Amino acid sequence: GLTEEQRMMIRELMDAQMKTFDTTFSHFKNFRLPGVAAKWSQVRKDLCSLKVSLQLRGEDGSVWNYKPPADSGGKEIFSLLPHMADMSTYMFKGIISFAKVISYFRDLPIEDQISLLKGAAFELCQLRFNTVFNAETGTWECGRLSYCLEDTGGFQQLLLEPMLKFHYMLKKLQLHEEEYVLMQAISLFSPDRPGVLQHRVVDQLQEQFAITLKSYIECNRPQPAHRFLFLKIMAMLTELRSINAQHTQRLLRIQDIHPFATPLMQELFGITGS
Template sequence: MSSESEARSPLDDSEVEESFREELEEDDEPKVCQVCGDKATGYHFNAMTCEGCKGFFRRAMKGPAKFRCPFQNNCLITKSNRRQCQFCRLQKCLSIGMLKELIMSDEAVEKRRMLIRRKKMAEDPAVLSDHQESLIQELLEAHRKTFDTTFSDCQFRPLDRDQNPMSEYSLKNSCSQNSPNLMGPVELRKPVESSLPQGSSSSSFSNCQEAEKSSKREKAFTTLPHITDLSTYMMQNVINYAKILKPFRALTIEDQISLLKGAMFEMVQMRFNMTFNENTGIWECGPLNYCMDDAARAGFQPHLLDPLMKFHYTLRRLHLDEKEYVLMQTISLFSPDRTGVTQHGAVDKYQELLACTLKIYIESKRTGPEKYLLFPKIMACLTEMRTMNEEYNKQVLQIQDIQPEVSPLMLEIVSQHS
């Protein structure tokens, strides 16, 4: 080798290769692998070789195997026979000056790859395309037309909190700590069975059940009329939102219904989350303030309310902006695996576009390292919502059986799982 090559400072393979590629741009003369004669791609481990011999040398030096020549230790290594004798091929690598010391450890390779990725991300920041910008604006306008966070146009039946006995949820998770004026008096009832005398007949037990059921109808869920009006209002707004979207209108009526039924509970809760105060645990809907006990007084049970409350805290603490909320809601709407959906391809394609848009929006608009975890956290919240969907449908039907005041729209939405 020339004195210039011998004086070369020990550089790692990638740096030398990058330098060599720059030289190739200035010199069109083909380079030949000094091991096997194949076309060389650069200097690897201090010698000009092809990619094949480069990989062979790295594996040979890092592996425990010891090679033996089946012939006379002087095989001629060519492109066609280089795999026939590993011993002589390795000796040729060493003889042309390839150095084991220049082989990077697996940890060093991974660290270098991470640095390259970070450098590339810094040089090429995520940027929304014109189509994605237009998509976000379209969704945002549709959202603002169909959701008023001040609830200024709402006309609901009064929210009666005074006469309704506190539920099991109220006892465990009373919001009176944060807003005592929202709570009514505490009243506990024993289960029907505990008040029966020993030896009671099945008919008397049945009569007691009917009496208890009648009593529940009279005063069990005093906030139900208001909560029904509120829920129906929110559902109508979600329907109006979906009807504005061109990709939604392009689907069959049957698929539109299936998507709305599947996503309704999730989208309503995500919209409610935009009004949630994480410091007080109160939903501040303009002149209307709600705590979770209002839902309990409407008949909903802890099996739903406990994870739902946790969800609202989790999502609100992500501090999403309006555009992120809207994209999240629409991803939920366009879920191809909802029961009854037939146009899976069209729905899946649009959901993928929404998800990519949300991811790029976060990367381009957010700052700080936490932005790289925000997208997966949002997707985890969507998954968590789906686990509560079935329980919500189940409890709505149970409430309707005890106190038939659930609106026809609510019943139609939950009928998918009935």
């Protein structure tokens, strides 16, 4: 029951997703790995909230496993930062390529493209990561890389971290590929990001992506479990925006006392190099 324009709109987004999302992470390579005063207290809280072990499955059948150190009041809490910087950079590139393929994005002024990507790159990265999240094992399955949440409390204590609660709650909605990519579009075309000039154009595009999503759900999900699903998704996007703001401040705090951001991360977060 979608209109012609809505069916074309979903197809272009699905097309962009297919072309730019390396779902097996086969081209993520050359990444760094861990080696073989009230600020620090806050940075310690910042880093200790998302602790993961790492596994690497070699193409030959070998397996490397990394278990992170406990916080002992030292630099060891930074040991996974270079690797995560490389992974974030890889995802950011796919997100930039995603936006560039979309006609509605490419027709915006170049200054607004940059402002929208700076505002939504993290959110779109999280949305893509959720599609490889395994909620039963607490693992992001990134092809031959796996990131497994470290035990602690149990899961209920882990779900107090908002980013982890977001991933579990979003996964439980059991969304289709089309609903994920419409969420990426609504997030990308947010008219209220810092520096956006064509505010009215972006707002109208966002409204159309949300209408298409509302219509998609109504045409393809009649089950009582999916009542209010559209409103649940919009609430998740509002929460993802809040998480985006928390993560930025948390990144800038860590960067203030222990630099790690790659050049592309610096560009996206307003770090000038000076």
